[PDB]
Amino acid sequence: HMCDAFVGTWKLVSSENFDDYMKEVGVGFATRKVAGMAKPNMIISVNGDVITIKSESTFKNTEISFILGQEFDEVTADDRKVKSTITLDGGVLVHVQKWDGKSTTIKRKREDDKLVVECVMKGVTSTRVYERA
Numbered sequence: 001h002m003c004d005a006f007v008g009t010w011k012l013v014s015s016e017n018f019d020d021y022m023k024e025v026g027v028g029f030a031t032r033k034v035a036g037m038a039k040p041n042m043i044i045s046v047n048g049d050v051i052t053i054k055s056e057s058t059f060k061n062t063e064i065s066f067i068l069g070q071e072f073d074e075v076t077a078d079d080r081k082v083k084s085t086i087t088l089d090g091g092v093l094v095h096v097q098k099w100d101g102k103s104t105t106i107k108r109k110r111e112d113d114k115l116v117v118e119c120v121m122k123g124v125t126s127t128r129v130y131e132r133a
């Protein structure tokens with residue numbers, strides 16, 4: 001029942017500062033423009049200890065499956081090949097991605113009826129708000 005309140009199908013409804021986050025990560029111009037337009041659905045499910053997070057959009061469909069605390073290699077939507085570890089910290093899913101000596105952290109939390117995604121790269125934060133689909 002760890003992640004019960006995350007399970008379901010969620011649709012992006014707002015984004016702030018995502019272009020600056022993508023710049024800080026190193027995403028190139030064309031990918032930033034097309035990725036910034038996307039209105040993904042995020043589909044979260046749990047089966048035993050395995051959590052699956054799917055993102056589906058007109059830009060790029062992604063899927064990760066993982067066990068909390070157990071590192072996994074991930075190909076991001078912008079085509080980085082990263083090493084990821086996701087943990088639960090005080091009810092927040094904390095997702096750290098490492099690549100090329102760099103690191104970014106994505107936090108996913110339930111706030112009221114929303115799922116709030118905070119993406120941080122150094123000093124730059126983007127907030128993406130999802131509602132139930």
Ligand SMILES: O=c1cc(CSCc2ccc(Cl)cc2)[nH]c(=S)[nH]1
Pocket residue numbers: 022027031032035042053055076077078106117119128
């Ligand atoms: O599941 C998720 C994860 C995130 C983390 S940044 C992903 C991402 C990265 C690069 C590009 Cl070009 C587009 C997208 N943001 C939302 S909204 N949902």
